[model samples]
Target: SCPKNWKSFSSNCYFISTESASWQDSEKDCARMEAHLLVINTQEEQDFIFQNLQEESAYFVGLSDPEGQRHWQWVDQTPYNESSTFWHPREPSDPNERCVVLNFRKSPKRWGWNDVNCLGPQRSVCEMMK
Candidate 1:
């Protein structure tokens, strides 16, 4: 994946893999690596992600709605802006599935949030000094 002072134009990171992690855990991982879960904010950014994506599968991101239908929030503690780039439908379902991960299982190739097991494994991507 592209490293070395790499930066996401939008909320997205450099890459995401098939690894697994809970929303909170993923946030920490991002912090340790100097990044946060991928948070796409526009088509250009999405296209960028599509271009460098090493894996065709969807991975986890830094979003969650822990309150169950309450509100979605990013790891940075930002509210879900209606203009936010993307959102998987019927997402943040149950509190048990508050975590988010990319879903390539869906027909359309786009980013979506899904409730998942915290312990589940999902690949990740980040950026830092080269």
Candidate 2:
């Protein structure tokens, strides 16, 4: 069920966008393909994503705390587990940083997650059920 050039894992398809966009806009773009921002459900899934991303730019993921700080949630409405998250040190620092992204530039050896301003433009990843 993955599109050509898209990667499939755990019955889902993952896509990394070529263009940068604000978090809200990125989700809408994914919606056009009947998908949503990438939602990492496990360390394994996260690792798969980490291995595929480019280092020069960041990309939005589906994790966010739209309702309030400390209440991060995925687009699929799945509960978030901080223990399994891949946050950069001291990240989610600003309460206003509601959207999460896989920050490729922040880490040289591994992918790190960052809570960022949702209004800022960034490349994004999309995921859909197979």
Candidate 3:
């Protein structure tokens, strides 16, 4: 079950962290809470997350190209597809950007995903099973 002020949808509970931290730190924070960085599995879920984010703020999601360049994957170890991905045009712009964040504020019309350096500080979204 989700804690008070958290949001529940389907079989998952989501918590939007108010504090900002590096991607690794945010991941650790989620782990400490018995969850993981949010893993978006569907368009509906992605849309829901986009709608919930505050304007001009980005939140980290559980996605990374740990294997580098062509080997992007979710935290749950699911494969990522370039064509089916939610990335904004021409993005995942750099090979060095390993972590992913949901870009809601930068472009509301797009509300797309962006790959960034894991060491950068940002807020995060955490998800766990009920």
Candidate 4:
């Protein structure tokens, strides 16, 4: 089942928050909805997301390097896959940049993930099973 205004695909529901928040706070927000931040499995699903986002700001996803050791993980327990990553060509990050975000708008399709400071506020996307 999907909530009103939430997009449904492959038996999962996706939602984007209207308010900005830290990654931790955003995850808690989604937790209350019984969901986790977005976790992209394939280009098909990744494509579905950017089309729905049309803002100059970014949207936090579930991906993070929790220990800040560059070893990333999806908040949903899926094993991180280097072959499946979509990090930005520029690879936005510093030593402390741990969280990821979905933010971009380019011609011929060029949006990708970015590592950012998790404490900063940004809008977020959530997903849950049907």
Report the number of the highest-TM-score candidate: 4
- Each model's lDDT: 0.59, 0.86, 0.84, 0.86
Q: Which stretches of candidate 1 lie over 4 Å from their true place?
A: 1-13, 54-56, 83-85, 89-92, 106-111, 127-130
Evaluation by TM-score, superior candidate among 2 and 4: 4
State the displacement of the C-alpha of residue 42, model 4, in Å, after optimal TM-score superposition.
1.8
Residues 1-130 of candidate 4 have per-residue lDDT tens digits of 6889898878899997779999999999989999989988888888888878865779999988878788888887888879878877868477598899988856545788888899999999998888
lDDT of 2 at 64: 85
**lDDT (tens digit, per residue) of candidate 2 on 29-105:** 99999999998887888889878888878999988888654799889899887787788878888888899988765
Q: What C-alpha RMSD separates each model from the true structure?
A: 4.0, 1.7, 1.7, 1.8
Native-referenced Cα lDDT, model 4? 0.86
Per-candidate TM-score against the hidden true structure: 0.65, 0.91, 0.90, 0.91
Question: Among all windows of ten consecutive residues in candidate 4, which has the lowest summed lDDT?
Answer: 103-112
Put down candidate 1 lDDT per residue, 1-130, tens digits, no spaces: 4454454454333645445565566667777876667765556865665565544555666666666675667666756676654556766556777666656444665555566766666665442322
